[PDB]
Design a binder for this molecule. Structure first.
Ligand code: A1CB0
Lengths: 147, 139, 128
């Protein structure tokens, strides 16, 4: 007997270099029990507590002249207040000292439990899609699990 | 168990050399309701949604470049191919510590094999119990 | 189905668990969650550490979930935030066969670095 628990696990489209497009129409990606993926956002089918999680992986070849700041943020767009409200956020400075060139890898993980309402849209965005590494699978993803 | 939900929680062997070997015959480790541990891989007993998870803890003394990887893979029985479900790559560089937790929900089939590997077993840390583990929970 | 999801009390200089929190179907909060019936449980948690700059003494941040049936680590991790403000969360989660009456604790070593202002500081169990 399958679970009736709203769950989703969507992955970065590896073809869309220079963008962060979430896919459920990809191997080992899913939407279950009412969760929808609409306009790059997960739509919550019913109210309740949910675990929200996401990982992005950033990669760079050395350290450039201008300082790099990498951000990943998970936003909620409620039906009654249709503006992005941050739930989870994290910032990283991959290069402490600039190159006076070794590849660096910086994962950003976000996860937490939030009360969500029916129709809430969830966004998961980065500031630098040009640094995102999603060629190999399993590195960039975004999911929910209803408690 | 009375729930009958296939579950597993396996732990790393601290005295395994140059490898990340999983064990179920340890305290606070288990294989229940059909899940098997065969060739260092977890074997799924039935089709369904599963929470799949793993934690590794790396540790180094100072900074000498080092790349750390941690990957959960799936070998689907119909396909016979090994693909990453969850993967992290980190460049860590006094002692430094790097925990890596990989978790998510996946549709799995009967007979799928799941693996949890790393590139640097020599950087693993086993100072305390509960620092290196791998598991699944059927929804 | 015995379930529990407690949050931290923002209680100073400590990690006190309290009841978006919920306690139900036998799971009591005696500072440990007490297991009402023998079975399989997913036990999870997250803590969030934060600081400004790096001190002279090397700081190691730990978060551990223990089982008391003796005190044994079930889930544990360590973070070294200093090899500018910083934030370091620690996530734990796994499935465990527990006995009726067992106690489960979720502790940190450095509550002075805990962030008391989020959906990232919690401790919970779900009977499967
Ligand atoms: C449906 C099922 C199997 O009963 C179930 N119920 C609840 C959860 C649950 N897991 C949590 C959590 C809050 C939760 F309610 N907070 C954490 N976890 C674990 C570890 N860690 C922190 C993570 O960040 C994480 C990242 C992906 C995946 C699981 C985790 C997971 N699975």
């Amino acid at each position: 007997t399958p679970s009736d628990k709203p769950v989703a696990h969507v992955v970065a489209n590896p073809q869309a270099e220079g963008q962060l497009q979430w896919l459920n129409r990809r191997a080992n990606a899913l939407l279950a029990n009412g969760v929808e993926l609409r306009d790059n956002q997960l739509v919550v089918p019913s109210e309740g507590l949910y675990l929200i999680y996401s990982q992005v992986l950033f990669k760079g070849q050395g350290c450039p002249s201008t300082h790099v700041l990498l951000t990943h943020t998970i936003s909620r767009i409620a039906v009654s207040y249709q503006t992005k409200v941050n739930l989870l956020s994290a910032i990283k400075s991959p290069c402490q000292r600039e190159t006076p060139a070794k590849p660096w890898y910086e994962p950003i993980y976000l996860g937490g439990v939030f009360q969500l309402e029916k129709g809430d849209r969830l966004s998961a965005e980065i500031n630098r899609p040009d640094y995102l590494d999603f060629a190999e699978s399993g590195q960039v993803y975004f999911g929910i699990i209803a408690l």
